[PDB]
């Protein structure tokens, strides 16, 4: 009965820009979700300031994106001013907090320290 619903989510993830292997988790597991929001949602930002916000999330060579990428066990796609997050419910909350802090102007090094603490303290992390 749930076959058709799972397939529709799978193709939608690919359209958003996720990898095919990446989106394949929507079929194999039953508890993965997608979350989206705009950069202007967290802070009203314009012009060159908006461009610097995008750079702070990505980092040099995408390393800042990859740093949060592994530790939260999530896939995130940054499409212009739209941010898409793929993961489980608890893991989406962790990634969404970290990305919001970067937009508000915190340096990436400060963000790195916090996410290490949050992941380590959580005993049960599915």
């Amino acid at each position: 009965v749930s076959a058709l619903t799972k397939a529709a989510d799978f193709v939608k993830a690919f359209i958003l820009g996720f990898q095919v292997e990446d989106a394949l988790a929507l079929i194999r597991l039953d508890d993965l979700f997608l979350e989206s929001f705009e950069i202007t949602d967290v802070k009203p930002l314009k012009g060159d300031h908006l461009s610097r916000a995008i750079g702070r999330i990505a980092g040099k060579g995408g390393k800042t994106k990859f740093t949060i990428e592994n530790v939260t066990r999530t896939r995130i796609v940054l499409a212009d001013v739209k941010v898409h997050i793929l993961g489980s419910f608890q893991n989406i909350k962790m990634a969404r907090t970290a990305i919001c802090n970067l937009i508000l102007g915190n340096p990436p090094s400060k963000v790195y320290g916090n996410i290490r603490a949050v992941a380590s303290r959580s005993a049960d992390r599915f």
């Binding site: 749930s2 058709l4 619903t5 508890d31 979700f33 979350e35 929001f37 705009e38 802070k43 508000l104």
Partner: protein, 127 residues
Amino acid sequence: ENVFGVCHIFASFNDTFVHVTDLSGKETICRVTGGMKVKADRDESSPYAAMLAAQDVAQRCKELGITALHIKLRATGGNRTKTPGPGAQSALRALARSGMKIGRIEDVTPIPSDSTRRKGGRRGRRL
């Protein structure tokens, strides 16, 4: 043939609403919120809470002869975020698992053309 109904899903910041009406949307059949299932304020918005709400709604329509549902996904809209959350997705998944027939999916989040100032000021929000 299948008897059709309209189901309204509202995934708010801290809660999820499952509301089923007739085709005109004026007569209420059954509504269950996420807070009615879980006894905590952490998890009113959890996908598990929405799943339990969907099952109670889905079983209720079975006695009344409603077999098919149209779905209207909705977010908070306005100045705030425009997309349905994970709780709305889980509710739709749970509803199909119960065997309810699914009609057409439509997003009915209120989209302002041009809106007033959003709360938070210049500095921002959600730190």
